[PDB]
Amino acid sequence: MERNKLARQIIDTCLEMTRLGLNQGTAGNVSVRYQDGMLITPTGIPYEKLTESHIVFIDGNGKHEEGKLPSSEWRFHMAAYQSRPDANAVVHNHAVHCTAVSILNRSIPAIHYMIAAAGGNSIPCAPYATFGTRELSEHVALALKNRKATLLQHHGLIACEVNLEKALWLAHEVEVLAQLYLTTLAITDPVPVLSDEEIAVVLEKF
Amino acid sequence: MERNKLARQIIDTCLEMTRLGLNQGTAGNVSVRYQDGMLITPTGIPYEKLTESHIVFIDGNGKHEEGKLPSSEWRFHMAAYQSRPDANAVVHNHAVHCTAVSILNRSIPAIHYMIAAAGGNSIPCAPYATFGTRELSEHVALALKNRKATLLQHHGLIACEVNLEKALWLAHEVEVLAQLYLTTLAITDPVPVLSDEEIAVVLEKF
Amino acid sequence: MERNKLARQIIDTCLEMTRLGLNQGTAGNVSVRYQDGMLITPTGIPYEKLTESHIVFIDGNGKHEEGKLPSSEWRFHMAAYQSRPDANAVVHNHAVHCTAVSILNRSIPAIHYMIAAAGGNSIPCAPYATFGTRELSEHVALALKNRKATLLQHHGLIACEVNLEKALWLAHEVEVLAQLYLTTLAITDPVPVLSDEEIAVVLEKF
Amino acid sequence: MERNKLARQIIDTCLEMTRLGLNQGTAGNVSVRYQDGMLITPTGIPYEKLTESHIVFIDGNGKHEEGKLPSSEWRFHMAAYQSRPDANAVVHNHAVHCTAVSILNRSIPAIHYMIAAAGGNSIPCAPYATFGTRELSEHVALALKNRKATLLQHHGLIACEVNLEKALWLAHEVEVLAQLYLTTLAITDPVPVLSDEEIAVVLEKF
Ligand SMILES: [Zn+2]
Ligand SMILES: [Zn+2]
Ligand SMILES: [Zn+2]
Ligand SMILES: [Zn+2]
Numbered sequence A, B, C, D: 001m002e003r004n005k006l007a008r009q010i011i012d013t014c015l016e017m018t019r020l021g022l023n024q025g026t027a028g029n030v031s032v033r034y035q036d037g038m039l040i041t042p043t044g045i046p047y048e049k050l051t052e053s054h055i056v057f058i059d060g061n062g063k064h065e066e067g068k069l070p071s072s073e074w075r076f077h078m079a080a081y082q083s084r085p086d087a088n089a090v091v092h093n094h095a096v097h098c099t100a101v102s103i104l105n106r107s108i109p110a111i112h113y114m115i116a117a118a119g120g121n122s123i124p125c126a127p128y129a130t131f132g133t134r135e136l137s138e139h140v141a142l143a144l145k146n147r148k149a150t151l152l153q154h155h156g157l158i159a160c161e162v163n164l165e166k167a168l169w170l171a172h173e174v175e176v177l178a179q180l181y182l183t184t185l186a187i188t189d190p191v192p193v194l195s196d197e198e199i200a201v202v203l204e205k206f
Helices: A003-019 A075-083 A096-104 A113-118 A134-143 A164-185 A196-205 B003-019 B075-083 B096-104 B113-118 B134-143 B164-185 B196-205 C003-019 C075-083 C096-104 C113-118 C134-143 C164-185 C196-205 D003-019 D075-083 D096-104 D113-118 D134-143 D164-185 D196-205
Strands: A029-034 A037-040 A056-058 A089-093 A149-152 A156-161 B029-034 B037-040 B056-058 B089-093 B149-152 B156-161 C029-034 C037-040 C056-058 C089-093 C149-152 C156-161 D029-034 D037-040 D056-058 D089-093 D149-152 D156-161
Touching (some): A003 A037, A029 A075, A075 A089, A134 A149, A156 A164, B029 B075, B037 B075, B075 B134, B089 B164, B096 B164, B113 B196, B156 B164, B164 C096, C003 C089, C003 C164, C029 C075, C037 C075, C075 C134, C134 C149, C164 D096, D037 D075, D075 D089, D075 D134, D089 D164, D096 D164, D113 D164, D134 D149, D156 D164
Antiparallel strands (some): B089 B156, C029 C037, C089 C156, D037 D056, D089 D156
């Protein structure tokens, strides 16, 4: 659990995210909980030029290391951490299907049993607020209180978990649920869903 | 036909399934008929960390090897084997197009002549039941009686064949038929189909 | 222009076709004009196991080399050759978008100027006939008289050109036109097209 | 900033464009501002056969190097350069989503905040004119006056920036916005957009 090991994983997650196609228009950012704050990807540097030494440390006060610019979207990573004590890694991206559902400003209902992976019977969509602002941070914090992933209106997705591996895995799964919802919605509205009882069983089961 | 050779193929099938994009949200599982039961992928371990020694043997009684956890979805692999004596390999996944059609709870009609590859003029959709349960197992067994592949409502796909190569090939083909059906359905409903006589000829021909 | 060189290109075309994603459900077949007939891919062997020695020679009489099974779809490759004297290579596949348009049984109208690459203001859709039959062969021959590519109802695509490189290139381009047509048709019907005069200029220009 | 270094980047951009899937039906062309004109990809040669020595120099007068054929679409690259003094690289392609929106002849409205990357609250669609003509050149020049990217009706996309890296990045981003617009439009019309004030803030913020 040396900083550099955490720094490598973050980078490995960026590359993998792109591999899975979640990172289009190279807009994602990834962070891990560290000391009294977090380690996050910097702004500007395209993921393939990323070296361990580029990862930026931001403390609990919001002050980042001297001479390094953290991601322009860092404020809501800090909001995720303070909203979910159990969260140790955060993955943000603008995956296409997730983003299309967020433009429609709809939550993703229980169309598949795997919806329970985020903690409940849905993936909410937090209201729009300009990126990098405290108001956007509040919307995210409120959305993550009872869910591990949320869509952001006219923007994209935030998923948090206990480690980068699961966080990435969750982000990917929400993208699949997003694609499933858009594909069926184009055929029929509303889309058939599993009842709350049924999701209650799957949750207990997980 | 040593266990380890069968163990490698299972792994090669998982990797290939992912390559083809059938394994998104890393939820598939694969098994082969072996001795009095089957060899199946374990739960938990992400496919890229899979080694021959991870594959789990489950006997005809449902008892699995000590210290190894089989896939959480193993019960319906055993149901496939007991429902189709001729089946020697089973491929399960949550491919997106197949899953979208299963959410609509529709069977795939004869929109393409290749539909005959599964044994008839359609790919059925078995009713929803919580994963890992005996009730889901019954639904699958009934669906596979006269077909080699079936969709599972709000869930995904199961395809069985004489070996892993053909099983994987069939799974892939159903995913293509699923995509063809969703794409045309968004334009026109119902989608034009080939008559039963016509499918009767193609079957005799295959 | 040794047989083995032509045999390698055919194989390189199969691999490339798959690379581009035109070969899903591994159903394509490729041929080149040779001596008094053609060299074609065999049936059964999955493209990655293909070696030069697997390619089958079929003469003008329809008799193929002893001990080798040509593609099950060879008859319409021979029809293409006799219908278009200028054709030296034939590419057949079941690309998804092309196939979806063929299920709707519609020709692709002039929605993009590149439609002229196939020779006119459209990509026709030849009527359905059981695969491997002489009746299907007639439908194809008639469709290829004034076009270099045609869709086959409830089936797929056939594209022919002066060499494998251009044939593959044309097949790919028709798949793009197919995707463009399905995507816009889901929004508006009919889809806006370029006038015949306009296509007359582009043709003269090509 | 030797010619050969600029020649390599152009080639690296073609390969990367294809990698991202923006170059389907191999129809794109790329140029950089150089001396009194530009360096552009040649016509005919498929990108994988491209060597530095193939890149063609065209002067401000429209005269290209002896014995080398520049891209058939070079005239609008020269129009981009004379319309946007600040433009140093131009990327043109026929990406599928961009092209589908251009067939509908619609501009892409502010459905996502990243729309500001092209300079305003939209991505316009310039009217159709036969490729390679001066009339098409005029349409493009007018469209690029206040935007860095534009769709071309029944044709594709042109994006310009300060260097190849950003130009490619912009082209990619417009393709994502195009896909987001088509996907949501198939569900609801009109698609929800962010207000002009909101885009005014994001622009100031960028
Ligand atoms: Zn963002
Ligand atoms: Zn499952
Ligand atoms: Zn065929
Ligand atoms: Zn063009």
